[PDB]
Amino acid sequence: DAPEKNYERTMAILQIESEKAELRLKELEVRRLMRAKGDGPWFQYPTIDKALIDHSPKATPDN
């Protein structure tokens, strides 16, 4: 094959692998910030649904 072919093919391989490596580092940092701060869509461990609450008037009023 041409040295042009191997050269430009090497540059394409290096672009794809460098972008994947940068996105893996971003993946680690996003997971760290979402476990630490808890404000991302990941690690949303479920709390109690507030559609389960009775809001009708009860029998004793202090509630």
Binding site: P3, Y7, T10, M11, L14, Q15, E17, S18
Partner: protein
């Protein structure tokens, strides 16, 4: 053939044959026998071969590399630019290796062709050889077998810090 400026060969001064005795040397008769028996049939076969070479003429070229940006004007961890600078530096590494080989060939050819007076009559060749070995040792020596553009750049920076401290302490 080649260039006589990159491969210097001084003019040969052969003396004229001055025979002192009447006994003939065998060497001129052997030169005649080598010319008739050997040199002319070899030359005729080369003539036929070169007439077959001349019927089809095509050319190979020297691969020219335009200079890409080197490692000093590349950003850090950018593999697309420092790959180009790395290939540039490796090609310059091979070319400088062959420059050192050319100057060694000059030195060895001088030491052979100047006979026993090669200690006197090879001053310029030894001077150029010492300069190119000093430059090659400043540039590429001690990089290790994982050599790269970063290693050579850091070696250059360490040498320039040593030179800056040496000029600062001597001023």
């Amino acid at each position: 053939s080649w260039d006589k400026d990159v491969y210097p060969e001084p003019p040969r001064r052969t003396p004229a044959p001055s025979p002192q005795t009447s006994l003939p040397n065998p060497i001129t008769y052997l030169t005649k026998a080598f010319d008739l028996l050997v040199d002319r049939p070899v030359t005729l076969v080369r003539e036929f071969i070169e007439r077959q070479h001349a019927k089809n003429k095509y050319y190979y070229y020297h691969r020219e590399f335009r200079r890409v940006p080197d490692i000093t004007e590349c950003h850090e961890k950018d593999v697309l630019c420092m790959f180009e600078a790395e290939m540039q530096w490796k090609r310059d590494y091979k070319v400088d290796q062959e420059i050192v080989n050319i100057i060694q060939e000059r030195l060895k050819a001088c030491q052979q062709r100047e006979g026993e007076s090669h200690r006197q009559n090879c001053a310029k060749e030894l001077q150029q050889f010492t300069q190119v070995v000093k430059a090659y040792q400043d540039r590429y020596h001690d990089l290790g077998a994982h050599y790269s553009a970063r290693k050579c750049l850091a070696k250059q920076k360490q040498r320039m810090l040593a030179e800056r401290k040496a000029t600062k302490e001597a001023a």
